[PDB]
Subunit: 336 residues, 3 copies
Amino acid sequence: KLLYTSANFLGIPTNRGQPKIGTYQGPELIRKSNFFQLVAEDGIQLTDCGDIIPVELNEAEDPQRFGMKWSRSFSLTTLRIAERVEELMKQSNKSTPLVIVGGDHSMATGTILGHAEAKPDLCVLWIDAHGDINTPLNSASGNMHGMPLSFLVKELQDQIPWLDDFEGIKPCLNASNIAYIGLRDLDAHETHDIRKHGIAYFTMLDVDRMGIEAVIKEALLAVNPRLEKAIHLSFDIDALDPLVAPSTGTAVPGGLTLREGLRICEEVSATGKLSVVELAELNPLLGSQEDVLKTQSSAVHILRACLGHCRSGHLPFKVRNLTDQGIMSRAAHMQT
Amino acid sequence: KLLYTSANFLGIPTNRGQPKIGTYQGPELIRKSNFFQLVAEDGIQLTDCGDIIPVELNEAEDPQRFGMKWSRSFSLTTLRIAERVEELMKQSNKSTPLVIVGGDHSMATGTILGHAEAKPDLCVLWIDAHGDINTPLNSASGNMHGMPLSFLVKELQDQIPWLDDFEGIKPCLNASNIAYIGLRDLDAHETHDIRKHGIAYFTMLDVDRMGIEAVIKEALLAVNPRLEKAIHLSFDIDALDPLVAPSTGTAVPGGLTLREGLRICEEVSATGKLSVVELAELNPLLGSQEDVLKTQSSAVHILRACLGHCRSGHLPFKVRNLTDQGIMSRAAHMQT
Amino acid sequence: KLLYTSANFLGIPTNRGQPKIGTYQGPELIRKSNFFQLVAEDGIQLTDCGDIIPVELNEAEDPQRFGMKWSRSFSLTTLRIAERVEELMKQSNKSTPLVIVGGDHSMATGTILGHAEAKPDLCVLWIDAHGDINTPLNSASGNMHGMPLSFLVKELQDQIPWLDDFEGIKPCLNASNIAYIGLRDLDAHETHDIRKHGIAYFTMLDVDRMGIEAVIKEALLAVNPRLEKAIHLSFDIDALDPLVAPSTGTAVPGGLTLREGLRICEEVSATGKLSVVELAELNPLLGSQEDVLKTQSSAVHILRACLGHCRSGHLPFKVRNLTDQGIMSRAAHMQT
Ligand SMILES: N[C@@](CCCC[B-](O)(O)O)(C(=O)O)C1CCN(Cc2ccc(Cl)c(Cl)c2)CC1
Ligand SMILES: N[C@@](CCCC[B-](O)(O)O)(C(=O)O)C1CCN(Cc2ccc(Cl)c(Cl)c2)CC1
Ligand SMILES: N[C@@](CCCC[B-](O)(O)O)(C(=O)O)C1CCN(Cc2ccc(Cl)c(Cl)c2)CC1
Ligand SMILES: [Cl-]
Ligand SMILES: [Cl-]
Ligand SMILES: [Cl-]
Ligand SMILES: [Cs+]
Ligand SMILES: [Cs+]
Ligand SMILES: [Cs+]
Ligand SMILES: [Cs+]
Ligand SMILES: [Cs+]
Ligand SMILES: [Cs+]
Ligand SMILES: [Cs+]
Ligand SMILES: [Cs+]
Ligand SMILES: [Cs+]
Ligand SMILES: [Mn+2]
Ligand SMILES: [Mn+2]
Ligand SMILES: [Mn+2]
Ligand SMILES: [Mn+2]
Ligand SMILES: [Mn+2]
Ligand SMILES: [Mn+2]
């Protein structure tokens, strides 16, 4: 009765991809929730594989290079993440989805790198208000969480500056393997690159005009037309409207409703090809206590959908019956 | 110009169906609002018929039986409610809708029981995040507000334990007479029963895929295909998204928008068959002061829609004209 | 690459159209935001033309007349506004949109009056929870922000009382030139007038049944069928749901989502006929600090859409390239 009967859970508390402290508490926000319990109530066996420890260098060891902040912390963390994800995905080779909770979105360079080592023909569905595809000299901020796809996309490599410590970060994605949903705050140079190299993208304007059901269908058709490929689902929590996920660093008004979010994850889950889902940019240090609780529960419902939770209900494993307990029913009594 | 020119209002402050104190203040939350005034501004004559007094036994008088909490308080309250609703509906036999404000949802066993005495061929539209159809041995909580339909549905009576004090609670509904809208947190055994006995149900997944306009149409077609039957509309306020109804005991993210809620009620009202509407699970003791105000106003707009309020406007009874007052208009002056 | 390369910005801090203090701070709420900066980042040259000073008489100078509150302050302010807007629109005669930030909605009588002097064949798109078309003897409140269209519509002039100081407020609109979107709280006499004189109107019920995409299309077809006419877009911030614009004086539940709001403005902008947009009823003195921030940002995104901001992204003016900076790319290095 289950598409996935087992899953792995992994925390990655990245916080050097952007300057607001708190994304390192993202994984704990989910472990504190009722997520594990709810997943078990649906019959799925979920193993907590712990946390990856990011490499966090001090300032002297990691000065700006090409405007990037903490780029050596990033290159070392990226390789450490990729190694771990690769090994998790190879022991898994019904499939066993890996659920990753961040951490700021700079982690995706590592998770996709490692994922692609185990499954080189994968596709990527990127759910985000933002493109996360700035090349370093175009980044207005220097924040690495705004650049993680640019290092992975083969077509962009003539706009990435060479750095020795980045050598092991091999571009493993073709522009044709990525589709965006949720965009509403692209930088001009992101827009240029996306359109030039033909990356499939469905912005909130597309969601408004097409509806989320057509958008999901067209995104899957664009990068996984016959469901042949493993799916890496990279879900930025700020893809969702600030009304349901306020506790995140770069919140943008006019986002996906929670329900639109669930629909993306439900459809992706139902392909049977969900290989990795990562959830980025939870920051429980942002907003009120009630803000944190809203963001937490949105995250939990999103992750549950990813593992196959069905809003139209699940059947019980064992169907209970009164007579087995030696109890007299109303129907039985009315008979006698 | 009005489908219903008169209506009755009844409070039922049930609070022994679930453990959070405060649902007993639900009716007063609405009497304190501008509801009565707004209904009068549309030309509808609304009579406040007061409150039913629930039977609330002490612990010694009402211990657990088959895991149910406060089950004798429930059986006695159910009969008291049914008697009152029956008598209100028979004096009413244009029709006169009865508007009931709860109170936790355990009251529905009584309201439907009494309603069905006056109108035995009725149908039920159940608007809820939850199924409220757990049979007692499957209930994980023992809370009666999670069980009220199970006692009414004929097909379920071989899974209801016999209790003498429940004898007068006669199953008056066929599975074929009920349709759900809004579901998103069914228990596994609810799912089993609903599907086994073919109860029409439209979950939030159906609402996402079909749209609320098709959902309403299909729900009405399923249980009232030619508008021959009286309608009992049982509206749990937690059917609506927590963003618009936060002050309720079992809030579930991803609910109906207020507008989707209004559309259900507008269509149900416009059939001319709305016989009873009850609004359950208001708890003004939950949430901030602003939470309570949001929940209150959502409830008021919902109830107004039920009585035929039209968002596209109403015509005046008397059309006013300047000349009657002996006043010179701009047009008149420009003439002379 | 731009439909409008220049725009003017004008504040009108009206506050005598309604009794809650604070709408006079509306323009400053927007000047304090990042609006100007964001508009510049899209390549649009925006000139701040300052504020109009409303005429605010004391009580003795301005007693009630025909139940209207502050009607002489209104007539004098209306003429002062109209003169200023006219002169701004004539120097502008690619077109140069005028962006007006209120101020309560009583200002529209003046802005449309002056606009129509420069462009007499204009059409009006009125985005509002309310009709703002009460004639003075039908107004239950006496608040002028609830009456501004009634003075402009030729067909209504036999229901406007003559007042000498109103003589210069010439009715410049035909009922056939106006379309509403967003209505959900019409007064009965508004409903009567709208239907009698055939004013196009699309309420939230129409938005629910038709969807905003069809609604926009039909509104534009009704009053600007071949895009021949200049458009006056009069956007009441309370058209939007209180969840995204809480800081306004007459908030009504069940409004446009922010996204629906953006879609209206995006389509209106894209006609190339957007001549004036005014944004009314911001009140930063209402609600919490976070309420004010939500309302502010909703306003900013709305105004940006009006000037042609594209949620699917903009192309850069200058495309940057690594080699120009004498930097070695990853691709280049891999070659050698
Ligand atoms: N793209 C961003 C955000 C990336 C967020 C990372 B995510 O939360 O993981 O999706 C990034 O940091 O790369 C910024 C960049 C700056 N824009 C506004 C902007 C645009 C153009 C100019 Cl010239 C300037 Cl000065 C500012 C907002 C998004
Ligand atoms: N169905 C509920 C809620 C009924 C709310 C009553 B209403 O607010 O009037 O609609 C009820 O109380 O009957 C609960 C039951 C427990 N589930 C979660 C759950 C599911 C399965 C298991 Cl095994 C466990 Cl331990 C927990 C949530 C809804
Ligand atoms: N139309 C209103 C609001 C206008 C708001 C101006 B806006 O914020 O610029 O759109 C205005 O002030 O003109 C009121 C009038 C009173 N109704 C409720 C009502 C209806 C009928 C009667 Cl008989 C009574 Cl006593 C009350 C709400 C909107
Ligand atoms: Cl597209
Ligand atoms: Cl169905
Ligand atoms: Cl219409
Ligand atoms: Cs826990
Ligand atoms: Cs696109
Ligand atoms: Cs905080
Ligand atoms: Cs009252
Ligand atoms: Cs179903
Ligand atoms: Cs409280
Ligand atoms: Cs500023
Ligand atoms: Cs209409
Ligand atoms: Cs305040
Ligand atoms: Mn983002
Ligand atoms: Mn991101
Ligand atoms: Mn419920
Ligand atoms: Mn319920
Ligand atoms: Mn308004
Ligand atoms: Mn208005």
